[model samples]
Target: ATEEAIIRIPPYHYIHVLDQNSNVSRVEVGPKTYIRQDNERVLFAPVRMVTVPPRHYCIVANPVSRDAQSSVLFDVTGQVRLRHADQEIRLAQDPFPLYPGELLEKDITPLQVVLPNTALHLKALLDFEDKNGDKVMAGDEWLFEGPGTYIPQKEVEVVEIIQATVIKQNQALRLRARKECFDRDGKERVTGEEWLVRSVGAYLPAVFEEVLDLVDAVILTEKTALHLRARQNFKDLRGVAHRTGEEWLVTVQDTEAHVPDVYEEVLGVVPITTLGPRHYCVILDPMGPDGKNQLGQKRVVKGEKSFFLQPGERLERGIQDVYVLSEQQGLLLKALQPLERVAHQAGDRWLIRGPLEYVPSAKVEVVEERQAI
Candidate 1:
């Protein structure tokens, strides 16, 4: 049986192409074809939002049914700006002109079809108004199999699922390695605790954040910690934090794929094997293309997880740390940090047991609160 969808658009569906029957077309859909959330009635439509300079707006598609996949594309320009419990947005046109679909044979590739997020998928009508000032259908709505070949707005870029995974993995690995590396060196020996912060926008810019998505990561650390910020973004923290005497170890990693601007530094004197245009394999350290040093230097940090690295790079120091701990699980000569929290609750209970030790990036701040037993 074909997989049942919460929303359905029949396969091999037909549309009136007028003079051009075989020509492909652009379409839009709205939200009213189905039920609207009681609290947020305004979002009761299938809308795709695009961010444009000077202003950001949505290219609204009219929904024909709850399970109806048919959409009518409309010119939302200059005719729609209704704020219903959500932010007020401008429309550039209505009855948007359809474009001929590109014909090509389907083949497996790194590029996968992108899905619209909740903010875009939950709409019912195009953002156009009729002579009566009431919202009305604006353009032709077309249907197809699967997600259909709809492109996002200009300000919007298509993000593939695999790319996101790669970028995030690198981010987590890099951060963890950085933290542990510094911690191992000791606070006195290492730099003071530092944190990297990013902008608060909901979407990532193409050049900055998108560039990061090319990474792939492989993290090998003693422990993994997962944390999230108020913004609902997941931060994967991996490190070599110790327990007891000389027990835990921590590490951080950041592995975005695009060769760093410091590529000169990261790439070092590595030899490159040309695969094709803009594509080549790199080998690291004391070796040329013929020498077999595939492990490149580790680069970037994504929170606690190390970002992804090219095939040649692997955790030399990180794996070493783990090997040491696994062989011997006892306290060695180590200094504790005062700033480190006395205790932390990972789940139902605190993670630390026995005597607590301090380390770099750790500080002890006395609590002044009076305790009543």
Candidate 2:
């Protein structure tokens, strides 16, 4: 009696059916099934179907029969991203070694990308020296000016980010620093230094530079005086160069109290100095390049008037002392230099008697007072 070999597979189940030749086929069919043409008695084992879930993957061992097989693989039909081991930026690889697996999933780190007109402060832990001699020394902090991204590095420490400070007209920014650094102007700033910054319009402060105050330039006039000081030696707009710490007067200077440069500072507004109506005196230190009272230029200012005393200018004769000839008074004058437009060389003299007031040229002086009543 010959018997037929029948293989039965459950509805939702799978089985591996094999014949004498050791050929394998996965059969999934009805609970009761028939094998019409059979090679030999079937050798079967129940097998289960693998259902891969989302974002997950699995690998298989040798599916192909080969003698020297150490590794085998299968596609779990899912998506994976790949990047190389060491790279500054994470990017996809062109040719995959496995042809169908996943990339080593890497942890993403957030980077700071500084915006335009802004800067990020960075500190160095290791001394990063450039070949061109520009160096970021250990313990040194500096600004990374942007439109740039900052990647975290093992040797660098990221400090805070800073935005540009805007300046306006008629206002100056007082910027100070506690660290020794260089500015965009290539100006070297000493540690613990302070200065005035002017955009005269718009400007921004760099890293480590902080605003101390805002100096508003004062409006000036002919009647109002500006008593000012130079914190540092600097040239004025049109006035003589001033020395640091020297206080002086400004009357008819720049239209607007001459906007104080980082060097200039306003003392305050003062009423201008003027001589009395009945007064006459030698004005000392005539104003100009070297000084307003610097000896070389002496001028006589006679008053019946509203007038102003300029910077370095002063009343040589105590602001006022009348030429009291007592109505029997006269002055003897001598030319020290050729009096312009007047016929008098140096040492030329005229002693004139008067119940009169005599006006003498700055180039001339009184030799003696002659009076007889």
lDDT, each prediction: 0.25, 0.60
Cα TM-score per model: 0.15, 0.46
Best of the candidates, lDDT: 2
lDDT of 1 by residue, 101-189 (tens): 31111211222243432112212234454346865343322221223333333222333331212234233211112122223223221
Q: What clash count goes with each model?
A: 93, 4
- What are the runs in model 2 whose C-alpha is more than 4 Å off? 1-110, 127-137, 147-149, 177-180, 207-210, 230-239, 261-265, 273-300, 303-307, 310-373
* Model 2 Cα shift for residue 331 (angstroms): 17
lDDT of 2 at 211: 64
lDDT of 2 by residue, 255-327 (tens): 6545666777777777755667567777777776745346666877775655566655676665664465556
Q: State candidate 1's TM-score.
A: 0.15
What lDDT is obtained when candidate 1 is compared to the true structure? 0.25
